[PDB]
Design an enzyme around this catalytic site. Structure first.
Site, mmCIF file in Angstrom:
data_model
loop_
_atom_site.group_PDB
_atom_site.id
_atom_site.type_symbol
_atom_site.label_atom_id
_atom_site.label_comp_id
_atom_site.label_asym_id
_atom_site.label_seq_id
_atom_site.Cartn_x
_atom_site.Cartn_y
_atom_site.Cartn_z
ATOM 1 N N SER A 168 0.801 -1.218 0.000
ATOM 2 C CA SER A 168 0.000 0.000 0.000
ATOM 3 C C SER A 168 0.837 1.272 0.000
ATOM 4 C CB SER A 168 -0.939 -0.001 1.208
ATOM 5 O OG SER A 168 -2.111 -0.747 0.929
ATOM 6 N N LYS A 188 0.237 3.539 -2.833
ATOM 7 C CA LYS A 188 -0.819 4.538 -2.816
ATOM 8 C C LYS A 188 -0.266 5.953 -2.783
ATOM 9 C CE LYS A 188 -3.982 1.266 -0.816
ATOM 10 N NZ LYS A 188 -4.621 0.745 0.413
ATOM 11 N N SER A 234 -5.856 3.751 3.888
ATOM 12 C CA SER A 234 -5.422 2.589 3.111
ATOM 13 C C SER A 234 -6.605 1.865 2.469
ATOM 14 C CB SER A 234 -4.582 1.631 3.967
ATOM 15 O OG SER A 234 -3.519 1.063 3.216
ATOM 16 N N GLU A 258 -5.163 -3.513 -6.753
ATOM 17 C CA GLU A 258 -5.522 -4.105 -5.472
ATOM 18 C C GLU A 258 -6.619 -5.144 -5.685
ATOM 19 O OE1 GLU A 258 -4.292 -3.783 -2.542
ATOM 20 O OE2 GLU A 258 -2.999 -2.015 -2.707
ATOM 21 N N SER A 276 1.033 -3.169 3.982
ATOM 22 C CA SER A 276 1.042 -4.510 4.535
ATOM 23 C C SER A 276 0.616 -5.478 3.450
ATOM 24 C CB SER A 276 0.118 -4.635 5.755
ATOM 25 O OG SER A 276 -1.223 -4.333 5.407
#
Length: 260
Positions: A42, A45, A102, A138, A209
């Site tokens: 992440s 992002k 997230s 994702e 993560s």
């Protein structure tokens, strides 16, 4: 002594640790496995959000553009998007959700705005980052498979890119300020780099993560009384269902701080 302390932390953790610190007061660097690839998870992002910010420099009402959130758009972790299903969220709201909560649907919407993972990579390349690659959306970008180059970067390149985006001029002034505001408002980082740093320092960070107990954090840091820093910590483990080891990132930040 810093490299030895980081190596001892890595050995104790059973995993693979990557650290990069840029001290912008004097532009010194501290690296540990800094040119080794790690799965970004992440932390990607950040790049995607910056790329949308970059688009908004030449599309002025872009951040305010509503994007439709369909039920089928929801993935495995949608704390904000799940409340706007069958509604819309603007790109500013999506970027804030991606960076500060997230939200993976928000990330997938940002990626879609950029035309796919390659649009994020293309933004990386346009600002001189030649190492970053985003291949997948994702959730599959979190597979973090040992040796897989997909969706990876190095600590050194990530630290340099984060500097250009937040302290340098990869983005325009307002866009850089917006990105800094977003990172500062992160809700997920209290246990990561932040937990290893003196409590009076201001921190903007993005955690990540993934599988293989992948535990990541990238941060821009404003110590009390001194020039900002960039600190990236990428940790991954040998077993696919390994538990996250955020304390390892905190310990790496603590080691790095005692030498600054």
């Amino acid at each position: 002594a810093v490299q030895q302390k980081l190596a001892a932390l890595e050995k104790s953790s059973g995993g693979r640790l990557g650290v990069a610190l840029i001290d912008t007061a004097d532009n010194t660097q501290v690296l540990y496995r800094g040119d080794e690839r790690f799965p970004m998870c992440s932390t990607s992002k950040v790049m995607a959000a910056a790329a949308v910010l970059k688009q908004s420099e030449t599309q002025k009402q872009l951040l305010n553009q509503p994007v439709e959130i369909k039920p089928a758009d929801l993935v495995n972790y949608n704390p904000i998007a799940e409340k706007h299903v069958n509604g819309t969220m603007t790109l500013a709201e999506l970027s804030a959700a991606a960076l500060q909560y997230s939200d993976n649907t928000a990330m997938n919407k940002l990626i879609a705005q950029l035309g796919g993972p390659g649009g994020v990579t293309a933004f990386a390349r346009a600002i001189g980052d030649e190492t970053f690659r985003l291949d997948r959306t994702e959730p599959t970008l979190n597979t973090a498979i040992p040796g897989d180059p997909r969706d990876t970067t190095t600590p050194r390149a990530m630290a340099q890119t984060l500097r250009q985006l937040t302290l340098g001029h990869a983005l325009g002034e307002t866009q850089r300020a917006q990105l800094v505001t977003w990172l500062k408002g992160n809700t997920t980082g209290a246990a990561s780099i932040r937990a290893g740093l003196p409590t009076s320092w201001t921190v903007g960070d993005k955690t990540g993560s993934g599988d293989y107990g992948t535990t990541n954090d990238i941060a821009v840091i404003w110590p009390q009384g001194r020039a900002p820093l960039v600190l990236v910590t990428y940790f991954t483990q040998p077993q696919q269902n390994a538990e996250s080891r955020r304390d390892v990132l905190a310990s790496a930040a603590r080691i790095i701080a005692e030498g600054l």
